[PDB]
Amino acid sequence: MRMVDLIAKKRDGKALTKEEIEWIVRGYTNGDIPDYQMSALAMAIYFRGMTEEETAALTMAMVQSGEMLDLSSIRGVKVDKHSTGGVGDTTTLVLGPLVASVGVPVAKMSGRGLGHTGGTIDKLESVPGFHVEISKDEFIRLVNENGIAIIGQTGDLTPADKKLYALRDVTATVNSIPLIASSIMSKKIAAGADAIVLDVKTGAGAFMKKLDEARRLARVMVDIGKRVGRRTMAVISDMSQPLGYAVGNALEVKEAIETLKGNGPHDLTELCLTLGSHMVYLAEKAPSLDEARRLLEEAIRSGAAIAAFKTFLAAQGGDASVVDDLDKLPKAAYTSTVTAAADGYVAEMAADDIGTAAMWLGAGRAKKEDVIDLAVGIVLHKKIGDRVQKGEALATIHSNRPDVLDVKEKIEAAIRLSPQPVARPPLIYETIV
Amino acid sequence: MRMVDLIAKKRDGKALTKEEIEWIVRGYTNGDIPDYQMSALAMAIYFRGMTEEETAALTMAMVQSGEMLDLSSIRGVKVDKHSTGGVGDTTTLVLGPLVASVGVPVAKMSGRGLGHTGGTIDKLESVPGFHVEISKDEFIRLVNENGIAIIGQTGDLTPADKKLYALRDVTATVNSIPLIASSIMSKKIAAGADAIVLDVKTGAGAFMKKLDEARRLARVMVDIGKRVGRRTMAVISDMSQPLGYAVGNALEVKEAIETLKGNGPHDLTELCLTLGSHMVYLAEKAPSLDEARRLLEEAIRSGAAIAAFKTFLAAQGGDASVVDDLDKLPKAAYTSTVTAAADGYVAEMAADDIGTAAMWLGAGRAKKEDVIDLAVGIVLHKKIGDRVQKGEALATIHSNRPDVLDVKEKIEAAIRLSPQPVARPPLIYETIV
Ligand SMILES: O=c1cc[nH]c(=O)[nH]1
Numbered sequence A, B: 001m002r003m004v005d006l007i008a009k010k011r012d013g014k015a016l017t018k019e020e021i022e023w024i025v026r027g028y029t030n031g032d033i034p035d036y037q038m039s040a041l042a043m044a045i046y047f048r049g050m051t052e053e054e055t056a057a058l059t060m061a062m063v064q065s066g067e068m069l070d071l072s073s074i075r076g077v078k079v080d081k082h083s084t085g086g087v088g089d090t091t092t093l094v095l096g097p098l099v100a101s102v103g104v105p106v107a108k109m110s111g112r113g114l115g116h117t118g119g120t121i122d123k124l125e126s127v128p129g130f131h132v133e134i135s136k137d138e139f140i141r142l143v144n145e146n147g148i149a150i151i152g153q154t155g156d157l158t159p160a161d162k163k164l165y166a167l168r169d170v171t172a173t174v175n176s177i178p179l180i181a182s183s184i185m186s187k188k189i190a191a192g193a194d195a196i197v198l199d200v201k202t203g204a205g206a207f208m209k210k211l212d213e214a215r216r217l218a219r220v221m222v223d224i225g226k227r228v229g230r231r232t233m234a235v236i237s238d239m240s241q242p243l244g245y246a247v248g249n250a251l252e253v254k255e256a257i258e259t260l261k262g263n264g265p266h267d268l269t270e271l272c273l274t275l276g277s278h279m280v281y282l283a284e285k286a287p288s289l290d291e292a293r294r295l296l297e298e299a300i301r302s303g304a305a306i307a308a309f310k311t312f313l314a315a316q317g318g319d320a321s322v323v324d325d326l327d328k329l330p331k332a333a334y335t336s337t338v339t340a341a342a343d344g345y346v347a348e349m350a351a352d353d354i355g356t357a358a359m360w361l362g363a364g365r366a367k368k369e370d371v372i373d374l375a376v377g378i379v380l381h382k383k384i385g386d387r388v389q390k391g392e393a394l395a396t397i398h399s400n401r402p403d404v405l406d407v408k409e410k411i412e413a414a415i416r417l418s419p420q421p422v423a424r425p426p427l428i429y430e431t432i433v
């Protein structure tokens, strides 16, 4: 068997067999298939794609390259969650503590941000003393003890994916359905959870720009989980504009706290209660989705949700007192606004542009090795559909430097006003079970 | 600039500027741009393509990587020739010494194997001691003192093509009009010859499957040569089946010697006379094509062509005695035969698959650093039109290993049979001047 012949099969739009795919992955991981042949195959896939069966085989071959986490030591159904990537995506910070406050065992690994998309790991680090580099044994202890653990994606699992993603990053082959599906699922399956709830983002701030692309991505990932016995489910949500109002790290943590206390943005709250209901239901902690939601709503109203957040924080080294005293969180020295040109209605608020603007401010990194300024970011004041008056603030920039024209300009490039009322996009497009 | 930003430009269907193209070729050649990024770019070019302008800029960039030769010293019209690649193309081995025997100065650069297609540089290395990498100064001194020279690149001439050619060969990025055109033309330009006769293959065994595709590639190349003051013409020959019988390296050289003596295959002899007469006419060594043709047929019968072949070999270190005794040429330890499943007529033939099978036997490389076997290959016994009976041998395999059921099945699958008679396909289709 020759790698070149297989690249050719893909180039000509033919389907690779499971045996060919397995041969490829192990050869790439062990070094017998050089990067120059893998990069060519990756570009061929970017243009030709894969069948649902091909993508499944690619995923299993990557799972095989590493070790599998045994979480049996934790009794009951363990639930995992994962977003495809977005802007202002505060979800996990709220969802995790919320579902664990009603008894759901949350076993979750996350990643850091890069480019115009944020990372939960980076947001968690804005909390004084929080540790994300947790081992397999520390992880199990945390879940058994508090019912939740959100840690960094510890080396060791799926080495083939770590290698391949790095390659896709320098060859412009990141945004490919087959490569995105197999990347995310290989990690969740290797992580060990019994149930997996996926949040597939669609729009300008996502990898899947078109709705039809998002549907195909959610579908193949759900199918992949069910093939190996995991209880998988997915929602397709809006990312044409940032979720909530805050975009950053310390600012997104403050938004998470206000939401858990019952005073957050309507879209963030609705998304969490919807994703949460599925997590609770799948963990068999409530008879139906309606009962599961009532529990979550009661948990917020009672104060159990915010209590579980503090416990979550302290358990990993976090300074829990930042919850009732937000001022202990990193603060930016400067604040300035972006005002509306004229009266009208917001029609566009491009997530990718807002994402890049935040990154330039210091809330994101251009390359993996870069350090983040945890205090800076952008807080939006209006969303698509909202009426605006000429001279009214549309966004506030939080910075540690007074010269921010490059940021203000990117934010202005994101907005488009209309003289007539605009139709608001749906927060949730569809649910795949 | 950043290579990844350029791969992404081409990936999205945009055209690269002259400056970007030169920057890429420059960086790749000095080693600052890694093979995996270049192979990713080459695959994006395969799907998205390039404009007439982009293709010309690429061609010149690769010429500018080395130095262009000045053949003024040599008196008269110096001629060059090149094929777009095929299966069993022994052409150059016969045609080179043939025309050179009648007074036409030959200054040619060739390449090694490329995908399912053979390479004259590899075929010539089958001859004991034959050097294919002589200095530019020795190249000029050889075309003068002998009136012929066939060498390989990477000798200060087109360093970029040397690299990109080897990479394309093992990454399945060989069949792109802009990569083929720029590869061939950059060599013809850097070589320094006045006239250029191109042999554009069309059919299954070629990169250009349909006539329209082949006509398009001939046009692009002929226009590129004229644009720089070269007498450039092209001929579109058939490759819907291998040329002659032999397919390999040492096996094709033996076919060359047999043809140069007037004992060779009709289709191969014919093609060499067609292309050869064009070379003599453009060199002004004959009043017309027919006179040039009859001048070639005379060099064969007189034995001046074969005597010219021996002188050619010895001039570049080769062993001339190999013509006398084909036993001095590399031989394969094993012999196997492929036979007919039923009686009938050879209708079609997947020539590319027959070329790949030969490469599987070791006639071609699987990775860049690979070492090939010059003794292996395939020898057909039946062609399109011929009548066959069950059990009759269609071909004979030459292997360095006993087990070849993989190769034996690929060849058998490539040769289709039929109940009714079938016409022999035409050797020449068109002529572009
Ligand atoms: O692309 C091609 C094909 C044949 N010969 C070359 O030099 N390049």
Ligand SMILES: [Ca+2]
Binding pocket: A087, A088, A089, A090, A242, A243, A244, A245, A246, A247, A252, A255
């Ligand atoms: Ca937010």
Ligand SMILES: [Ca+2]
Binding pocket: B087, B088, B089, B090, B242, B243, B244, B245, B246, B247, B252, B255
């Ligand atoms: Ca031949």
